[PDB]
Protein backbone atom coordinates (compact mmCIF):
# COMPACT_ATOMS: atom_id res chain seq x y z
CA UNK A 1 0.00 0.00 0.00
CA UNK A 2 1.33 3.49 -1.38
CA UNK A 3 1.15 5.98 1.93
CA UNK A 4 1.21 9.39 0.34
CA UNK A 5 1.76 12.65 2.79
CA UNK A 6 2.32 16.04 2.22
CA UNK A 7 2.30 16.68 5.93
CA UNK A 8 4.97 13.47 6.88
CA UNK A 9 1.75 11.90 7.92
CA UNK A 10 -0.26 9.00 6.26
CA UNK A 11 -3.15 6.75 7.56
CA UNK A 12 -4.97 4.11 6.77
CA UNK A 13 -8.35 3.35 7.83
CA UNK A 14 -10.25 -0.09 8.65
CA UNK A 15 -13.83 0.05 9.37
CA UNK A 16 -15.18 -3.09 11.14
CA UNK A 17 -19.18 -4.00 10.77
CA UNK A 18 -20.31 -5.74 14.17
CA UNK A 19 -23.90 -5.41 12.70
CA UNK A 20 -23.51 -7.61 9.72
CA UNK A 21 -20.93 -10.00 11.26
CA UNK A 22 -23.82 -11.07 14.01
CA UNK A 23 -26.21 -11.35 12.17
CA UNK A 24 -24.31 -13.65 9.58
CA UNK A 25 -22.79 -15.76 12.32
CA UNK A 26 -25.29 -15.20 15.10
CA UNK A 27 -29.01 -14.06 13.89
CA UNK A 28 -30.33 -14.96 17.15
CA UNK A 29 -28.98 -11.60 18.83
CA UNK A 30 -31.51 -8.67 19.01
CA UNK A 31 -29.15 -6.01 17.19
CA UNK A 32 -32.44 -3.93 17.51
CA UNK A 33 -32.43 -3.11 20.89
CA UNK A 34 -30.87 0.18 21.79
CA UNK A 35 -28.35 -1.78 24.43
CA UNK A 36 -26.85 -3.74 20.85
CA UNK A 37 -23.48 -2.34 21.60
CA UNK A 38 -23.78 -3.61 25.61
CA UNK A 39 -24.85 -7.05 24.00
CA UNK A 40 -21.88 -7.34 21.12
CA UNK A 41 -19.41 -6.07 23.95
CA UNK A 42 -20.70 -8.72 26.27
CA UNK A 43 -20.90 -11.48 23.75
CA UNK A 44 -17.38 -10.73 22.60
CA UNK A 45 -15.95 -9.52 25.96
CA UNK A 46 -11.83 -9.03 25.34
CA UNK A 47 -11.12 -8.58 21.44
CA UNK A 48 -6.82 -8.58 20.30
CA UNK A 49 -5.93 -7.29 17.12
CA UNK A 50 -3.27 -8.65 15.11
CA UNK A 51 -1.81 -6.99 12.72
CA UNK A 52 1.41 -7.72 10.90
CA UNK A 53 3.40 -5.41 9.07
CA UNK A 54 6.60 -4.08 7.21
CA UNK A 55 7.73 -1.03 5.57
CA UNK A 56 9.59 -0.80 2.04
CA UNK A 57 12.44 0.98 3.79
CA UNK A 58 16.54 0.33 3.84
CA UNK A 59 16.99 -2.57 6.51
CA UNK A 60 18.54 0.29 8.66
CA UNK A 61 16.02 2.70 8.93
CA UNK A 62 12.64 2.58 10.44
CA UNK A 63 9.75 5.07 10.92
CA UNK A 64 7.18 5.55 14.04
CA UNK A 65 3.75 3.74 13.23
CA UNK A 66 0.82 3.61 15.70
CA UNK A 67 -2.49 1.19 15.69
CA UNK A 68 -5.56 3.48 17.34
CA UNK A 69 -9.13 2.75 18.06
CA UNK A 70 -11.90 5.11 17.68
CA UNK A 71 -13.38 5.86 21.42
CA UNK A 72 -17.10 7.10 21.08
CA UNK A 73 -17.19 7.69 24.51
CA UNK A 74 -14.79 10.67 24.85
CA UNK A 75 -15.03 11.48 20.86
CA UNK A 76 -11.28 10.72 20.03
CA UNK A 77 -8.97 8.46 18.54
CA UNK A 78 -7.10 6.15 21.33
CA UNK A 79 -3.69 4.46 20.83
CA UNK A 80 -3.69 1.30 21.42
CA UNK A 81 0.28 0.36 20.72
CA UNK A 82 3.11 2.64 19.04
CA UNK A 83 6.41 0.77 17.24
CA UNK A 84 9.02 1.40 15.10
CA UNK A 85 8.51 -0.28 11.63
CA UNK A 86 11.19 -1.19 9.40
CA UNK A 87 12.32 -3.99 5.97
CA UNK A 88 11.37 -6.59 8.56
CA UNK A 89 8.17 -7.84 9.18
CA UNK A 90 6.35 -7.52 12.93
CA UNK A 91 3.32 -7.65 14.48
CA UNK A 92 1.98 -3.98 15.71
CA UNK A 93 -1.54 -5.81 17.17
CA UNK A 94 -2.33 -5.34 20.91
CA UNK A 95 -5.44 -6.64 22.92
CA UNK A 96 -7.77 -3.59 23.64
CA UNK A 97 -10.24 -5.30 25.94
CA UNK A 98 -14.19 -4.85 25.90
CA UNK A 99 -15.47 -2.91 22.39
CA UNK A 100 -18.72 -1.14 24.04
CA UNK A 101 -17.06 2.39 24.17
CA UNK A 102 -15.06 1.57 20.46
CA UNK B 1 -36.81 -0.94 18.57
CA UNK B 2 -37.30 -0.22 14.43
CA UNK B 3 -34.44 3.09 14.73
CA UNK B 4 -31.95 -0.24 14.71
CA UNK B 5 -29.63 -0.40 12.45
CA UNK B 6 -31.29 -2.85 9.78
CA UNK B 7 -34.58 -0.43 9.35
CA UNK B 8 -33.37 2.86 10.42
CA UNK B 9 -37.18 3.86 10.83
CA UNK B 10 -36.87 7.37 11.34
CA UNK B 11 -40.61 8.36 13.10
CA UNK B 12 -41.03 10.33 16.28
CA UNK B 13 -44.27 11.58 17.32
CA UNK B 14 -42.71 14.79 18.47
CA UNK B 15 -41.01 16.05 15.31
CA UNK B 16 -44.97 16.58 13.80
CA UNK B 17 -43.96 15.40 10.70
CA UNK B 18 -46.92 13.70 9.01
CA UNK B 19 -45.97 12.68 5.09
CA UNK B 20 -43.11 11.87 2.95
CA UNK B 21 -42.95 13.75 -0.07
CA UNK B 22 -41.08 11.50 -2.49
CA UNK B 23 -39.14 13.31 -4.92
CA UNK B 24 -37.91 12.04 -8.71
CA UNK B 25 -34.83 10.76 -9.24
CA UNK B 26 -33.38 9.86 -6.01
CA UNK B 27 -32.99 6.89 -4.11
CA UNK B 28 -36.14 5.30 -2.36
CA UNK B 29 -34.73 4.69 1.24
CA UNK B 30 -36.25 2.23 2.89
CA UNK B 31 -36.33 3.90 6.20
CA UNK B 32 -38.52 6.20 4.14
CA UNK B 33 -41.10 3.56 3.17
CA UNK B 34 -41.28 1.78 7.20
CA UNK B 35 -41.98 5.65 7.92
CA UNK B 36 -44.46 5.93 5.22
CA UNK B 37 -46.78 3.53 7.51
CA UNK B 38 -45.40 3.74 10.73
CA UNK B 39 -46.89 7.80 10.49
CA UNK B 40 -50.76 6.42 9.45
CA UNK B 41 -50.50 3.44 12.10
CA UNK B 42 -49.30 5.91 14.95
CA UNK B 43 -52.51 8.41 14.23
CA UNK B 44 -54.99 5.66 13.66
CA UNK B 45 -53.88 4.36 17.18
CA UNK B 46 -54.25 8.20 18.28
CA UNK B 47 -57.78 7.89 16.34
CA UNK B 48 -58.52 4.82 18.45
CA UNK B 49 -57.46 5.80 22.11
CA UNK B 50 -59.88 8.92 21.85
CA UNK B 51 -62.69 6.51 21.62
CA UNK B 52 -61.43 3.06 22.73
CA UNK B 53 -59.32 1.76 25.28
CA UNK B 54 -56.64 -1.50 26.03
CA UNK B 55 -59.18 -4.33 25.90
CA UNK B 56 -62.27 -2.92 24.90
CA UNK B 57 -64.73 -5.68 23.61
CA UNK B 58 -66.42 -5.04 20.28
Known sequence: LSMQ??????????????????????????????EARR???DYIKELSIDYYLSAVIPPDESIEIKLQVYDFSINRWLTVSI???SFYEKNIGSNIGYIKDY | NFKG?????????????????????????????????????????????????????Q
Open chain 1, 39 to 41: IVS
Open chain 2, 5 to 57: SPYLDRFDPSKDRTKVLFNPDRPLQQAELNEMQSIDQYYLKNLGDAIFKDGDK
Open chain 1, 83 to 85: NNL
Open chain 1, 5 to 34: TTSGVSYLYNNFNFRDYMSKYRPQVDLQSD
